[PDB]
Amino acid sequence: NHEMKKYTLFPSQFVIAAEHTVQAAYEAQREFGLDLGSLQFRTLKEYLSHEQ
């Protein structure tokens, strides 16, 4: 004779965020000419894969 079984699967989620202010960004741009938004964006993008 024969028999049958079954199994299941399901995924999960993740979430992250970053914060910065206008005056700090303006001061950094005036002094060093750096862009904070791109820095934080790339940092989050890298950190997600690293922790995965």
Positions touching its own copies (CB under 8 A) are: 1-2, 18-20, 39, 43
14/35 Cα distance (integer angstroms): 26
Query: What's the closest the beta carbon of residue 25 comes to its own copies, in angstroms?
Result: 12
DSSP strand E in 2-50: where?
A: none
Nearer of residues 13 and 19 to its own copies, judged by Cβ: 19
Q: 13 is written with which tokens?
A: 């989620």
Nearer to its own copies, 12 or 23 (CB): 23
Cβ 24 vs Cβ 34: under 8 Å:
no
Closer residue to its own copies in complex, CB, 2/50: 2
